[PDB]
Amino acid sequence: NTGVPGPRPEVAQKLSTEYQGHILRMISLAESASELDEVLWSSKKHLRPVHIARSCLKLEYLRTKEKGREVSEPIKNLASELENYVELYSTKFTIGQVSQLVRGLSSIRRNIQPDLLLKLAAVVVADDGRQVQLANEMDCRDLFFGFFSQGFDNELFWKRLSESVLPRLPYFNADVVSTVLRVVSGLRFLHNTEFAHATMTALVPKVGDLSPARLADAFFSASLLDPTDVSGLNAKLEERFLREFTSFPIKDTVTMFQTVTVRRHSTPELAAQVAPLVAAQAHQLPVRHLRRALEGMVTAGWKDTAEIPLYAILAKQAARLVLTPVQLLRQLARIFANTGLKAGPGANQPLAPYFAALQRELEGRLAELDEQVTDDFAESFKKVGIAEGARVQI
Amino acid sequence: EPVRSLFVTLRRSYIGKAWFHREILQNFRLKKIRQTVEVANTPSARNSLAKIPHLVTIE
């Protein structure tokens, strides 16, 4: 705290005490959801909007170690308890605090009540977007992704935010611009607009400053948003991938390869693409990424080779994960059928493990199967060569 | 293998001990030499037992 006059009395008149720092330290020191609950129980009467905002981010940090399992019960209980404070302080938050509230609750895959989201949106709807200026770059990237993840669709909110952020787009970091680009591609009322053109242009000179994950997202969003390269993003993004094809993680390499393939720019690079997958197939390939890999390889037209039976390994990996939504299972089966490989006739066929796992899973979830679903599976089963109404050999 | 509980046995008498140390023994409910109690393994219990390591045996 200082009494010296200055240009920004808004951020200089804030009162900071030792007691507030004491509570914030306890929140950060908590190492588990069980410990964090006890910290909040002791401090019930001494929680302020800053403490509530920080706690929501703590839930995001705590759940990162629980990579495999779903959201734990104590995390859900904490989220419900915190929401009681959010409603109480709905009109006492800053734009920076609201930014980190939505991100924290969105990372736990929780949905905020529509009445509460409307109240929190007043930070950017009131004062003609003056408060947007107070927000820094880190706040802006969380506001776009946080509200987008919540499913909040309000034209006035998004129109005002876009207008107040347009001047600063060229001077944001590359990753932040990529985040905004992905959000725009997901909103129909922002396609082919000045905001979209400005965002694409600002990214043109910042292509080389993107991180692998953000680089893949930008290329995916750019391809859908701008089929015709009127901004030059696609050419630059493709060039960077070619130069650094082997320098990116597997999941990023799969995403870019699929996007390039669907752009009808396939090249004889399959030999280079296959080797990374077999080297790292049992890891760095969740169900979503495996589907993208299958679509890209099948669309490109690579044929199974004796040296590297990629399809055989992929089928085994798919079976391991199954042993999921029926739609994903149906889509995977169709892609395998389009591959042109047999499963039933041969004793040891590349696709045999997948279909065998599929039959076992369907038997346990026969209630979910519908007439259309059964017909689609039957077509896939007929295509691969299993139509006798008998279980797979394996 | 998690440690779920601790066993505390009294070794020394109440005579000649400071009054702020007798309170700890009374909270653990130890009254006689060679008497044993079972307590839950919690951080608050361990802190108290660290103030009287010369009066008891812990396992």
């Binding site: 588990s32 | 440690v3 601790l6 393994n41 361990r46």
Partner: protein, 64 residues
């Protein structure tokens, strides 16, 4: 213990406090080993604590 060597009250024999014998030294060594052992055990307990605390029955708590 008494260190004072003056006065008419003979807390110690003439010459002051006497030095420890071999048995007394051995006695004091063992008293310290027990104390050090207790602190070592508390270290093991802290490194192997379970997530959920066990609930133990008590008749007096049950009544009230």
């Amino acid at each position: 213990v008494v260190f004072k060597t003056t006065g008419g009250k003979a807390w110690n024999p003439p010459g002051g406090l006497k030095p420890l014998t071999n048995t007394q030294k051995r006695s004091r060594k063992e008293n310290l080993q027990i104390l050090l052992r207790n602190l070592s055990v508390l270290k093991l307990a802290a490194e192997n604590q379970p997530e959920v605390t066990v609930n133990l029955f008590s008749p007096l708590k049950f009544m009230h």
